[PDB]
Design a protein around this ligand. Structure first.
Ligand SMILES: NC(=O)c1ccc[n+]([C@@H]2O[C@H](COP(=O)([O-])OP(=O)(O)OC[C@H]3O[C@@H](n4cnc5c(N)ncnc54)[C@H](OP(=O)(O)O)[C@@H]3O)[C@@H](O)[C@H]2O)c1
Ligand SMILES: CCc1nc(N)nc(N)c1OCCCCOc1cccc(CCCc2nnn[nH]2)c1
Ligand SMILES: [Cl-]
Length: 173
């Protein structure tokens, strides 16, 4: 069965969304990359963010596959404290306040930027990957979401590869 979910979330004059994929342990990144491959999550990330402003930390920009840098179809905003940073086809901003000026914004990583943006977020789109990768020194980590967050939990699904995952759609006022 499909998680008979409404999939509806009202919005106000500002919508700040966070979107990430995490292992059970909260690991989201390692060695400059994501330590699994999940086609359905790539498709999910693309469909949620298409047509919107996306905000990412400089290390997440570095981690994009060079052929989809900038991510097409989205206004790419890179957060860096390097005034001279070269992000061809994107814009570089020096502060989170300026990065979140678009009326709709999806924060797409990484660990540092999720943490700083979480107080302003009203949606979290989380892919939980059922992989038992323990946290290691240097890992990038997903935020811990408290009980101000509410929403819907999807059913477990298998990718054709056999990797198991599920989608959480969280929101708050
Ligand atoms: N699983 C997922 O969903 C997912 C999503 C995205 C990324 N990732 C992975 O996460 C890792 C990257 O995450 P990360 O935490 O190491 O780095 P990050 O959050 O992507 O980027 C950190 C950089 O962003 C800049 N920065 C951070 N806060 C800033 C602020 N308030 N103002 C201006 N600049 C700011 C700094 O750039 P400068 O050093 O240039 O000053 C900082 O070094 C990679 O492994 C990536 O593959 C995973
Ligand atoms: C996909 C990982 C991911 N998942 C979720 N749920 N949230 C994220 N923030 C997130 O990270 C995306 C930004 C960092 C890594 O970027 C990518 C890594 C591997 C492949 C692609 C191209 C995926 C297809 C595509 N998307 N847009 N055009 N094509 C991106
Ligand atoms: Cl992937």
């Amino acid at each position: 069965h499909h998680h008979h979910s409404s999939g509806l979330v009202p919005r106000g004059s500002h919508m700040v969304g966070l979107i990430w994929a995490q292992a059970t342990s909260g690991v989201i990144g390692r060695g400059g990359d994501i330590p699994w491959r999940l086609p359905e999550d790539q498709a999910h990330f693309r469909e949620i963010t298409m047509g919107h402003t996306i905000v990412m930390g400089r290390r997440t920009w570095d981690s994009l596959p060079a052929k989809v840098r900038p991510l097409p179809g989205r206004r790419n905003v890179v957060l860096s404290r390097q005034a001279d940073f070269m992000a061809s086809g994107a814009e570089v901003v020096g502060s989170l306040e300026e990065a979140l000026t678009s009326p709709e914004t999806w924060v797409i990583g990484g660990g540092q930027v999720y943490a700083l943006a979480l107080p302003y977020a009203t949606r979290c789109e989380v892919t939980e990957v059922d992989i038992g990768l323990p946290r290691e020194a240097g890992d990038a980590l997903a935020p811990v979401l408290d009980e101000t967050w509410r929403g819907e939990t999807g059913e477990w699904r298998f990718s054709r590869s056999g990797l198991r995952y599920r989608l959480y759609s969280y929101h708050r006022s």
